[PDB]
Amino acid sequence: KPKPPAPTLTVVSDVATVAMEDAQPATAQGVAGGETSMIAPQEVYAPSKDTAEKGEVVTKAGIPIAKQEMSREEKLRRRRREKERIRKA
Amino acid sequence: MLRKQARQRRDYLYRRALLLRDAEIAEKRAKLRAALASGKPLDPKIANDKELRKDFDYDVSRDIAKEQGEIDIDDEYSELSGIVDPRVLVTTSRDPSSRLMAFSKEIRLMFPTAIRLNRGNLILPDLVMSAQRERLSDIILLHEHRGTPTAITISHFPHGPTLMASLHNVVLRADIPKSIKGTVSESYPHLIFEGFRTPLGQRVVKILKHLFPPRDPTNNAKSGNRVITFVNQDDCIEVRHHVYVRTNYNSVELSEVGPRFTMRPFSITMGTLENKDADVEWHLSQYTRTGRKKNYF
Amino acid sequence: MKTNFKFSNLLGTVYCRGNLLFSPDGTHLFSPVGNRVTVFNLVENKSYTFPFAHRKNISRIGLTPQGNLLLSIDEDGQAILTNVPRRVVLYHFSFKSPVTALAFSPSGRHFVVGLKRKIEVWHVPSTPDTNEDGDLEFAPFVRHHTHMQHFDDVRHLEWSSDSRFFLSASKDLTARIWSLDTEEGFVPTVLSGHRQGVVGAYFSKDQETIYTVSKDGAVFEWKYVAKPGHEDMQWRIVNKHFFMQNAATLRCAAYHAESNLLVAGFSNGIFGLYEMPDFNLIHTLSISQNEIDFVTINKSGEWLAFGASKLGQLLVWEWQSESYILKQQGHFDAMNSLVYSPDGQRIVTAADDGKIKVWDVESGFCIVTFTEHTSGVTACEFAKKGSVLFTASLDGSVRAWDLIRYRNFRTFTAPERLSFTCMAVDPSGEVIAAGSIDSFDIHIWSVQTGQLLDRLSGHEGPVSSLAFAPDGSVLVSGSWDRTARIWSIFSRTQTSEPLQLQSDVLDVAFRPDSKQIAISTLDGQLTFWSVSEAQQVSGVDGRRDVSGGRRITDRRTAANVAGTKNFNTIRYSMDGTCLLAGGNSKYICLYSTTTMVLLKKFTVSVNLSLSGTQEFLNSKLMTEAGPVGLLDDQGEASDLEDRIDRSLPGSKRGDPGARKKFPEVRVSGVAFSPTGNSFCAASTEGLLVYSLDNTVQFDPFDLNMEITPASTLAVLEKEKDYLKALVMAFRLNEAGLITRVYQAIPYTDIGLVVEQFPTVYVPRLLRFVAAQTEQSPHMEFCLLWIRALIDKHGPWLAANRGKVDVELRVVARAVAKMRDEIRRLADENVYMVDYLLNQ
Amino acid sequence: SLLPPDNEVRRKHETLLLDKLYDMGILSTKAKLSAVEHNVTVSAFARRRLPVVMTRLRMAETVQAATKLIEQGHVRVGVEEVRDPAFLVTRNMEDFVTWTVGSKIKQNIMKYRDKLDDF
RNA sequence: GGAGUAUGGUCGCAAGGCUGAAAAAUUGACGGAAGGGCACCACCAGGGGUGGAGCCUGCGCGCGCGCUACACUGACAGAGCCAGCGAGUACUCCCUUGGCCGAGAGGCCCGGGUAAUCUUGUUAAACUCUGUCGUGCUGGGGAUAGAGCAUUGCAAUUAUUGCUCUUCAACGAGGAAUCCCUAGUAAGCGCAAGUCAUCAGCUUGCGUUGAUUACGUCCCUGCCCUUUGUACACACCGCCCGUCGCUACUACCGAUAGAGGAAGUAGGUCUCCGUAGGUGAACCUGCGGAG
């Protein structure tokens, strides 16, 4: 029986995959390969509430909408959806 | 596979015997730990045992863990307690009747993860073989008298205990019309047990509450709308199956949805349904003098 | 298909015990791999393997300074010299003792060799490559001199620059100077005074100072100066200086005399290089944890090549730039499994070292080593997409890597702790099934969800082989309950149809057109079942066809050894017509799935340093104390780390101690190439890639009498009937003639030729234009060919799809090469130029 | 033992050590560290070896005959034949040690039981 | 005498009635729409019960479990001839072969067995074959009834059971409904046991023969769940909707600063030279110049 799984985290950089490749005179990838930056756009930048602006909110779509331009009906519906998630949790 | 079941059952019985001897020693070691913390003087036969002190220095920590409840006892259910959904099949006797087959369906619907199997021509060792071959957690056999059921046999697998019980006052689901009854909801049921206080009562509580899949513990105190009640008086465990709405914060409306039993257990054997020669743990002592006065569970 | 498999390159190991060499140009690196010698071309990324094979492991490599002749010495001194431009075996000749030093003369006429105490200088044989009117002689080597003026092992031999003298460095602590012929002012003098025996004695450029590097870590200069009482001069010692590598002894040193620098590799793996005649430490670093065994230097002087023997660990180091040129590692454990990539350019193998690595088929180098498993890695598998790799292992985790970003996006475990030994994955890439030896249930997770879908059950024993069907509808499990299961998971009913067998199931494989399945049992028999109506349609009893054995520590005759009489792994062809089967035995069988006959049997290794490669061991090696390859000879070792036995008693599967003397021969994994025309097999020596030989074998298709190359070029050049010439060339099946006519017809008549071309020669033509796109620099011509072919024979290929799947796959990867190599650059250039022109 | 008794890493490594030794079959219980004090023993390893464990499983009659039979190569453990008489059989491979494929000892057992199937 | 553990007494507190039966919430209450998953308590295709006559346990002339049938895939008569789980006699009469006698039931003389040894290959039944009957309540069916002979038992009347002759009823596929069932499953068949509860008006095993039709779909009836979480690459999606509560703030209304009512919003290195000081030959620092 192997071992109980204990959490281990690995810090990857933003270098290309030919920095993870082994040492050899030239790469095995082509010219298109070698620009893939080893972390996805979701890890380069993901729009969320912790990185939003002060006046604005971000939706579930990843789009900044401001509380001032949001109407009363959409404010009520966003309050109801957040309260529905809170009731689910 | 069969050699592994036999080997694991033999290892379990040997570990239980070693636990008996180690409990006989560890009742003496818990006096040495309590006297060390509180300073009350202890017995000379305990304080002058060099083997006990020399091994006590290594075996403090499991006694502390058992005091805090951080570890669980060596049991046939503690291996897979809340990790796996226990699958369980309900079967009849050999040539069932129509009311026994409808009753088998009703107590299949009592468990949300159970399945029912047609017996037909199915030899009972091959029934046990197919259960261990499909990794079932429980089998439940039914016996009828004449369209009315008279016995259950709840057997836990791979090598766990049988509880054989005789049924009384069975009021079937299949007697009331379809206008009044309906399709029973299959949600994960709450369970309540009322009146089990002996260690034998906690044994039968364990082998009855490990038939049901484990409830999600995030918001289980308020969610879920279906309850199953095992309450014993005079060691005849009576079971109801209700469905409820919480019509207010102070009141609740119940609705009886399943069959009613008062099953009385008469045999709890440390060994599966095939083993007729398994060592019994308890049996209903009739034809003794005070077997009717003494109440177990 | 044509089952004519010769032996193409070995792969999967980069260096084993032996000497390293550079080409005289400086680009090719000659390294020994067991009993073969790979050539790594480093200027263009390529590699090949010489067609010879020694009976034991390589001891020495030498190379004539012109470049052409290579001379490889096995253990017990059997030598094979070969021509490196035309890769052909030339002469076999046995030095009767184990060669422990070897050096060719820089004039090229002689080579000197040190057999334990002896020193023989031989002539280099005259070869058919160099003479005009010449042939193979019988005994070509002519001995010139023998010198036994010596007392222990000759550890090194180094010629002069004018090739008139040489130096022999010893194990009796004395380097000596020898001549070729009797010179006028010379006596064959000795150079005494050391403490632990010389590693190497080297000349200088102007041959006055000669240096001696010894095992304790000391290098001494020797000059011809007068004795301190002053015709009367003596070879005496002017200064001495010491490498202060603290707790290690140097194992191999080299000295570049044109640039005056000395490199030394030590027992603790940290080498150091020094500008010698003033002894300034240029630098030093640790290339390996274990030790360094063999150092060589470039002829130019700018590259160094180090080899460690206990691991693979071959690395070339460019010292002035301070960077690796290559740092390569072979598997130092048993290669458990392998799979090709669905493109077919690279294969990925998973060993019991804990690492998996992705080798490229051309150039032979590993391109990425995934090292997240903490125990031995069992089966690895791909999806249909080819971008994701799923690997199971004994540490309890089925990991899931993405090969465009090189990170395991998923890891799966079972809730109770298992140790997975086999796994399969749906070709959609969304469901992983895996099975172990500890529990008999078979687990299924989802890739896009991450959590456990189910534990399928119904097996009365541990499940040994899993295979998802290539269309994606049926899992098949095979287990030691003598049973197999057709699991249908993806339907609304989840069902299991059992196939009852006669013994324990060892391997399960599908046909590519999924109607058939072959399951290989423990009796040694293959049974070909149908998956629609679950009935066995065919069967081979294959014990005798694979039984080749008698290991050391085996008290049975090789015919009575049970255990090497089964097929542990089987794979269909990409055609679907021939199985390939390999077990724990010397033979690979290649069966036909229709006619049920063995088409061809192969032998994986001739290497007698492995244990089970001949079924009749000779009685010369049986002393009165057991066999001679069984006595523990660790105590006769000079080094303590070689003398220590840190082995565990009774550990079949790997221990880090790992005595590993005479390992067994077993083929633990086989795989066909998805482009066809090759397969490969993971042996214990390496990873042998077999391939079809079409250029060295005449094989016409359906030939007439009036069809010659002269007649084909006649109807090309005179008559100018291009379709007739091309059909005649494909009918002759000579690749040079086909290339000649294919390039000769014009790019406006391509369409007429393709429109009137025959459909019996269409798939051969598609394979030929795929190869010409991937190889020749006539890219637009071959793309016009491919476009005309698919536009004319469009509905036929889509109607068939199974008879032409490999041709479509190789055409697809040819246009994938042209789609990823040139047009991304063209688009990026035109957008950058448009922006810079728009400021 | 020398760690303090209420320590988390002490409790976790006690359970890990006892579970590892009970899975290898050296200890017969997994609920006492005094088992690793005076019950782990080179004799416990040497009786988890292969000829003694098949003497206990009655595959042979005596450990001498068992070592002779697994030197002649009749015994596989799982799917692979075992020629080494020092292969340590763990508690879950004691359910998989059995005879080899074409074994004359297996033919002898079947000929005794009168189930000699020659197919 | 000290330390524990019990057992039974004694005492003190508990043991004083604005009283007279039938909330929480920034987290809460209830829904709707869309999309999934599952189900012989759903659809679809078939099969089988029960419900008609009689008997009776049980539950509260009425009811339930059953057995046997309505025949031609059959009844009958020969003839073939094949299991498996069992059991069986000591201070005893159990399992019984074979030999006669008897139409039968049975009788009788012996006999093997405390048993893988004898009964028993339990020569079981459906079943297979060659005949007879021919669609007719017929030779399907065999209730009810008469007369006779036997066996168990101290005893057989209200008929224990067994055999023979005779008598030959209903029942022509069960109605509406209602329920169950998907492979060694439905259904037929016998043999054995009687295990501290249940069960002889039966229960539970065990073998034998062994199909049709689904094995798809959420369209109907429902059940569960998503719309929060629980992992990251490819790839895809793109702020679900309503009625109220609670909280914070803002102003309003009107009786006596105030509890309520109603509402809304959330960049000079190196070297040299000339200096001035320092601890003086030198040397150091600072500056001014040239290379």
mmCIF file of N, CA, C and O in Angstrom, chain C residues 747-767:
data_model
loop_
_atom_site.group_PDB
_atom_site.id
_atom_site.type_symbol
_atom_site.label_atom_id
_atom_site.label_comp_id
_atom_site.label_asym_id
_atom_site.label_seq_id
_atom_site.Cartn_x
_atom_site.Cartn_y
_atom_site.Cartn_z
ATOM 1 N N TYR C 747 4.584 19.766 -63.605
ATOM 2 C CA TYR C 747 3.571 20.148 -62.635
ATOM 3 C C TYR C 747 2.277 20.622 -63.270
ATOM 4 O O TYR C 747 1.346 20.970 -62.542
ATOM 5 N N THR C 748 2.192 20.653 -64.593
ATOM 6 C CA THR C 748 0.912 20.856 -65.248
ATOM 7 C C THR C 748 0.290 19.544 -65.696
ATOM 8 O O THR C 748 -0.930 19.470 -65.866
ATOM 9 N N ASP C 749 1.106 18.510 -65.885
ATOM 10 C CA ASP C 749 0.635 17.184 -66.257
ATOM 11 C C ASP C 749 0.421 16.276 -65.056
ATOM 12 O O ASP C 749 0.011 15.121 -65.246
ATOM 13 N N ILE C 750 0.738 16.769 -63.848
ATOM 14 C CA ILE C 750 0.361 16.094 -62.598
ATOM 15 C C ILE C 750 -1.121 15.725 -62.588
ATOM 16 O O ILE C 750 -1.493 14.600 -62.232
ATOM 17 N N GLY C 751 -1.982 16.661 -62.991
ATOM 18 C CA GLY C 751 -3.415 16.414 -62.941
ATOM 19 C C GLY C 751 -3.881 15.346 -63.910
ATOM 20 O O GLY C 751 -4.729 14.521 -63.565
ATOM 21 N N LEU C 752 -3.295 15.312 -65.109
ATOM 22 C CA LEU C 752 -3.641 14.287 -66.091
ATOM 23 C C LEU C 752 -3.171 12.911 -65.636
ATOM 24 O O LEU C 752 -3.919 11.925 -65.733
ATOM 25 N N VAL C 753 -1.941 12.840 -65.111
ATOM 26 C CA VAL C 753 -1.385 11.594 -64.592
ATOM 27 C C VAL C 753 -2.217 11.052 -63.437
ATOM 28 O O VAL C 753 -2.569 9.865 -63.416
ATOM 29 N N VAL C 754 -2.578 11.912 -62.484
ATOM 30 C CA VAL C 754 -3.386 11.489 -61.349
ATOM 31 C C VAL C 754 -4.800 11.101 -61.767
ATOM 32 O O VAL C 754 -5.340 10.114 -61.249
ATOM 33 N N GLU C 755 -5.383 11.803 -62.745
ATOM 34 C CA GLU C 755 -6.725 11.476 -63.212
ATOM 35 C C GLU C 755 -6.758 10.119 -63.906
ATOM 36 O O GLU C 755 -7.761 9.401 -63.843
ATOM 37 N N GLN C 756 -5.669 9.740 -64.562
ATOM 38 C CA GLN C 756 -5.659 8.435 -65.228
ATOM 39 C C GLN C 756 -4.828 7.397 -64.476
ATOM 40 O O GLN C 756 -4.509 6.345 -65.020
ATOM 41 N N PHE C 757 -4.482 7.654 -63.213
ATOM 42 C CA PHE C 757 -3.703 6.707 -62.418
ATOM 43 C C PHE C 757 -4.575 5.571 -61.885
ATOM 44 O O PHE C 757 -5.783 5.755 -61.714
ATOM 45 N N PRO C 758 -4.015 4.387 -61.638
ATOM 46 C CA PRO C 758 -4.832 3.282 -61.122
ATOM 47 C C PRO C 758 -5.001 3.288 -59.610
ATOM 48 O O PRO C 758 -4.096 3.634 -58.842
ATOM 49 N N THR C 759 -6.180 2.828 -59.188
ATOM 50 C CA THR C 759 -6.538 2.775 -57.779
ATOM 51 C C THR C 759 -5.878 1.632 -57.029
ATOM 52 O O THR C 759 -5.928 1.614 -55.797
ATOM 53 N N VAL C 760 -5.262 0.679 -57.729
ATOM 54 C CA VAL C 760 -4.460 -0.328 -57.038
ATOM 55 C C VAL C 760 -3.100 0.227 -56.646
ATOM 56 O O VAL C 760 -2.520 -0.211 -55.644
ATOM 57 N N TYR C 761 -2.608 1.233 -57.360
ATOM 58 C CA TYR C 761 -1.354 1.890 -57.027
ATOM 59 C C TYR C 761 -1.550 3.228 -56.326
ATOM 60 O O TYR C 761 -0.557 3.892 -56.022
ATOM 61 N N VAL C 762 -2.790 3.661 -56.101
ATOM 62 C CA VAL C 762 -3.051 4.868 -55.302
ATOM 63 C C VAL C 762 -2.456 4.867 -53.885
ATOM 64 O O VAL C 762 -1.799 5.864 -53.544
ATOM 65 N N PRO C 763 -2.600 3.835 -53.027
ATOM 66 C CA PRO C 763 -2.036 3.971 -51.667
ATOM 67 C C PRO C 763 -0.516 3.978 -51.613
ATOM 68 O O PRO C 763 0.056 4.698 -50.779
ATOM 69 N N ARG C 764 0.149 3.217 -52.485
ATOM 70 C CA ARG C 764 1.603 3.283 -52.578
ATOM 71 C C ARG C 764 2.063 4.660 -53.034
ATOM 72 O O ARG C 764 3.060 5.188 -52.527
ATOM 73 N N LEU C 765 1.315 5.279 -53.947
ATOM 74 C CA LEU C 765 1.643 6.626 -54.394
ATOM 75 C C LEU C 765 1.438 7.645 -53.285
ATOM 76 O O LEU C 765 2.240 8.574 -53.141
ATOM 77 N N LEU C 766 0.382 7.483 -52.484
ATOM 78 C CA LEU C 766 0.148 8.397 -51.367
ATOM 79 C C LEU C 766 1.250 8.292 -50.326
ATOM 80 O O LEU C 766 1.730 9.314 -49.815
ATOM 81 N N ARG C 767 1.688 7.066 -50.029
ATOM 82 C CA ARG C 767 2.797 6.869 -49.103
ATOM 83 C C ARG C 767 4.095 7.444 -49.662
ATOM 84 O O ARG C 767 4.895 8.036 -48.921
#
